[PDB]
Design a protein around this ligand. Structure first.
Ligand SMILES: Nc1ncnc2c1ncn2[C@@H]1O[C@H](COP(=O)(O)OP(=O)(O)OP(=O)(O)OP(=O)(O)OC[C@H]2O[C@@H](n3cnc4c(N)ncnc43)[C@H](O)[C@@H]2O)[C@@H](O)[C@H]1O
Ligand SMILES: [Cl-]
Ligand SMILES: [Mg+2]
Length: 335
């Protein structure tokens, strides 16, 4: 292990989390059990959550969360580098301090014009509804990656991870990094992130897929992808196989597709096999479980462990995060 093995590109966001009821969702034309991008009409919701629903502030953003979980497991600071854009404000210092405390080397671009992005996380019964106000995260530019220091970080990384969420902000950066990775035989990995990603950016997804070595997503994202790509099936095993079998630029590494299903088994699909492997999870009697699953996976991948160990660490990490929330980061990883 050495510094900067993993680079992640994403949207650093402060989560604003609260328990609410359906009338709040109806007020903002939100569905239960969904993730959306904020529009003008959503904007008053953030202050309302803070002022009237006693909302909690939690460091978030998908890729940021995953790198924080991976660092917590690694216990070796600076092993992962994070790129994304924040404001110059109090929200950015909350994100900076939490991610740096966990061991991430954060390399934030700074917007002086937008505030740090936030994500409403609304809890209603056992359902969650998310509304992401990207704001400064949308000010990310390819140029941030072209400084001398930042290009040395790209040149030195061995592994790359990008969320589908980041396509909203800079697909051009994600693709550029993916092509350089394939061309130098390094791993490029990404997450489907949310149903809106294949629904909104189908062609981007198609264009980047040849350079994807590992694709993560949940069952709902996999089905959403299957609709846009016209697979005519909702069978997750079949969908995984079709994605895994897509043309691949770096033919020397066979694509892996990993599909999480909440409390049901994690599914592993490898190109060139017709046999999907399952990793059962102990059904727990919460925020970013999928992100934590990826952090656990990446912590083992960086230590060259086999995929089955990467996935078991993912499941273990998600289950820790579900138990202890932010407190998990104060403990000692005992995987
Ligand atoms: N535009 C945007 N840009 C950037 N970031 C954005 C964004 N919009 C939202 N975000 C970020 O998204 C974060 C929240 O994500 P969440 O919506 O909380 O969920 P996730 O991490 O995406 O979970 P996912 O659905 O993928 O995984 P699954 O349940 O299959 O579960 C995965 C694993 O968890 C474990 N698990 C889950 N449920 C379980 C159960 N019931 N019992 C036991 N284990 C379980 C299992 O091991 C399972 O495989 C927020 O922090 C926010 O900042
Ligand atoms: Cl992200
Ligand atoms: Mg997810």
């Amino acid at each position: 292990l050495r510094d900067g093995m993993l680079v992640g590109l994403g949207n650093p966001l402060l989560d604003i989390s609260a328990v609410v009821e359906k009338d709040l969702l109806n007020k903002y034309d939100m569905q239960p059990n969904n993730a959306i991008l904020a529009e003008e009409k959503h904007m008053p919701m953030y202050q309302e959550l803070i002022e009237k629903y006693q909302a909690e502030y939690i460091a978030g953003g998908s890729v940021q969360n995953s790198l924080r979980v991976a660092q917590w497991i690694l216990q070796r600071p600076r092993t992962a580098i994070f790129f994304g854009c924040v404001g110059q404000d109090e929200y950015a210092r909350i994100l900076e301090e939490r991610a740096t405390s966990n061991g991430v080397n954060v390399q934030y671009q700074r917007s002086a014009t937008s505030p740090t992005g936030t994500c409403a996380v609304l809890v209603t019964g056992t359902q969650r509804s998310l509304c992401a106000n990207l704001a400064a995260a949308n000010d990310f530019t390819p140029e941030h990656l072209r400084s001398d220091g930042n290009r040395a970080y790209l040149q030195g990384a061995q592994f790359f991870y990008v969320s589908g969420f980041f396509f909203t902000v800079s697909f051009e950066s994600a693709l550029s990094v993916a092509k350089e990775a394939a061309a130098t035989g390094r791993m490029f990995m990404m997450n489907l992130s949310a149903p809106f990603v294949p629904q909104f950016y189908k062609n981007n997804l198609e264009e980047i897929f040849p350079y994807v070595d590992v694709l993560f997503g949940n069952e709902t994202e996999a089905i959403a992808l299957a609709k846009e790509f016209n697979y005519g099936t909702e069978d997750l095993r079949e969908i995984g196989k079709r994605i895994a079998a897509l043309p691949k630029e770096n033919g020397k590494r066979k694509r892996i597709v990993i599909i999480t299903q909440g409390s049901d088994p994690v599914l592993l699909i490898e190109a060139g096999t017709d046999n999907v492997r399952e990793f059962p999870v102990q059904k727990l009697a919460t925020n970013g479980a999928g992100d934590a699953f990826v952090g656990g996976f990446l912590a083992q991948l960086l230590q060259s462990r086999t995929v089955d160990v990467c996935i078991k660490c993912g499941i273990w990490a998600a289950r820790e995060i579900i138990q202890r929330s932010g407190c998990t980061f104060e403990g000692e990883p005992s995987f």
